[PDB]
Ligand binder design. Structure first.
Ligand SMILES: O=C(c1cc(-c2cc3c(cc2C(=O)N2Cc4ccccc4C[C@H]2CN2CCOCC2)OCO3)n2c1CCCC2)N(c1ccccc1)c1ccc(O)cc1
Length: 507
């Protein structure tokens, strides 16, 4: 990373040209050049370059991914003065607090809202229950009432959780990844109404984001559920649209997941002092957010001064109101298990493979099982790193401990050749893991090849620390946990579970 310059990454759906004007003004006053870039899939590319102590000085993304960045050690801790913290809404600072430390600057507050075509529907519906009768009237005119992305649970969650569902319980400065709140009567009521809409032919089950967006922007549907990142495309379609509070369900408000667009500073950047000055003194100002906002809308903003003026726009007041009625999105990589489990529950309940009550009950069991598989992966990687001097029933953990130790000892000559020939880069790390794991289980699954599965991820975690790519260990731990949840768990339970592993290997 070049010292004396500021390289900034931000997604293309944001006002990156407005941010470039703020950097241009910063360059005139400091002599420090600010280069703003908008790479494709920067949320995947940032952990790769930052693992080798490289990449942008500043990254813009939602707060939920910054938890994984902070735990990896990719983001530097920010320490704003108390006079500057009072300028941002305190809940936005909460979304960027991890292990009791602030790891990002909050910028904008993103949340889903109800977007309606005023020409097709001058008065939008205030309740979900009156939507079916509305679709019937619009169907006679060749239009549907509501289309939105049904494939991602992020968009269906406002309705599902409106009557009491929650993703993870939060306590003691951490999320409880075993206390999942999808198995409740409220969520089953929300998922039932969603399935009823599909089975009554009010929505198509395979509608995704692009299908819904194109349908609303062309006037084919009266309403949609989307965030401020889509307002720019509706503007160019000339659809006279309004943005309002999400409909209520059983008299209870829809609670969407709240996302805090946040600016993190690379922990390897040599210009952290400059990045803090640019973020606090230039961007996080009324004039700085306005420059970005006028390029592309941010929705609600964390800066109280500029949010008070933006709230005059009904679209932004609705976004803030829908955010206040929602909940902050958990900022942990375990949400991938939550999303994966909930998505299957919705897919299966809509298709009819299982009941709504069974789908959410199984999704809660699957989420709790993922936490248990993570426990096995983490406890092994901690032991392997501790052997090398590095720092990061319980019988199964000590059984696997003896199994991997024996495997490494019996094939130590082979592990020495592998480690010396291994060329590990964050760009090619995911490919090497996927290729090897495929070869391990290509001809079937047994306990011996599962022990080898753990030991391979272990040596990749140790070799990552050696090549000064320590944050890559959290990515490998995530891949091992994913493969254990989605592939090996079918074989493990069918062959006696982990209790059969301690029966063959244990004492
Ligand atoms: O390519 C591999 C690899 C390792 C094993 C493997 C798995 C086992 C096992 C055995 C072996 C095995 O075949 N080896 C063990 C081993 C261990 C460490 C490093 C290299 C090797 C290669 C050979 C060597 N032996 C020598 C004695 O005669 C039999 C073969 O017993 C029970 O489970 N298998 C493969 C590929 C698919 C077949 C099984 N890695 C790999 C990965 C990257 C680069 C090179 C090899 C790999 C995958 C997972 C691991 O935990 C370790 C290695």
């Amino acid at each position: 990373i070049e010292e004396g310059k500021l390289v900034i990454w931000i997604n293309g759906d944001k006002g990156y040209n407005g941010l470039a004007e703020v950097g241009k003004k910063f360059e005139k006053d400091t002599g420090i050049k600010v280069t703003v870039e908008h790479p494709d899939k920067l949320e995947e590319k940032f952990p790769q370059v930052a693992a080798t102590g490289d990449g942008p000085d500043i990254i813009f993304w939602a707060h939920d991914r910054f938890g994984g960045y902070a735990q990896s050690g990719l983001l530097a801790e920010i320490t704003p003065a108390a006079a500057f913290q009072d300028k941002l809404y305190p809940f936005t600072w909460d979304a960027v607090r991890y292990n009791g430390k602030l790891i990002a600057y909050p910028i904008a507050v993103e949340a889903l809202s109800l977007i309606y075509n005023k020409d097709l529907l001058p008065n939008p519906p205030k309740t979900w229950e009156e939507i079916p009768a509305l679709d019937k009237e619009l169907k006679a005119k060749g239009k549907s009432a509501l289309m939105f992305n049904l494939q991602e649970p992020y968009f269906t969650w406002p309705l599902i959780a409106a009557d009491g569902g929650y993703a993870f319980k939060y306590a003691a400065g951490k999320y409880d990844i075993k206390d999942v709140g999808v198995d409740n009567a409220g969520a089953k009521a929300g998922l039932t109404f969603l399935v009823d809409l599909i089975k009554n032919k009010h929505m198509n089950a395979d509608t995704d984001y692009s299908i819904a967006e194109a349908a609303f922007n062309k006037g084919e549907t009266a309403m949609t559920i989307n965030g401020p990142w889509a307002w720019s495309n509706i503007d160019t379609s000339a659809v006279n649209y309004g943005v309002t509070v999400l409909p209520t369900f059983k008299g209870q408000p829809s609670k969407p997941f709240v996302g805090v667009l946040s600016a993190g500073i690379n922990a390897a950047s040599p210009n952290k002092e400059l990045a803090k000055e640019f973020l606090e003194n230039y961007l996080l100002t009324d004039e700085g957010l306005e420059a970005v906002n006028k390029d592309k809308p941010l929705g609600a903003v964390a800066l109280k001064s500029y949010e008070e003026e933006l709230a005059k726009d009904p679209r932004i007041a609705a976004t803030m109101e829908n955010a206040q009625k929602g909940e902050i999105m958990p900022n942990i990589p375990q949400m991938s298990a939550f999303w994966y489990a909930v998505r299957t529950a919705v897919i299966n309940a809509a298709s009819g493979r299982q009941t709504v009550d069974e789908a959410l009950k199984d999704a809660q069991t699957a989420a709790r099982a993922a936490a248990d598989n993570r426990e096995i992966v983490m406890k092994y990687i901690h032991y392997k790193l501790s052997q090398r001097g590095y720092e990061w029933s319980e019988v199964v953990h000590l059984t696997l401990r003896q199994a991997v130790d024996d495997f490494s000892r019996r094939y130590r000559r082979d592990f020495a050749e592998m480690s010396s020939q291994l060329h590990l880069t964050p760009f090619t790390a995911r490919g090497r893991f996927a290729t090897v794991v495929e070869e391990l289980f290509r001809d079937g699954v047994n306990w011996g090849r599962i022990v080898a599965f753990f030991e391979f991820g272990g040596v990749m975690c140790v070799e990552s620390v050696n090549r000064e790519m320590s944050p890559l260990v959290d990515n490998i731990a995530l891949w091992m946990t994913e493969y254990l949840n989605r592939h090996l768990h079918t074989w493990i339970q069918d062959n006696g579970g982990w209790d059969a592993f301690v029966e063959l290997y244990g004492p």
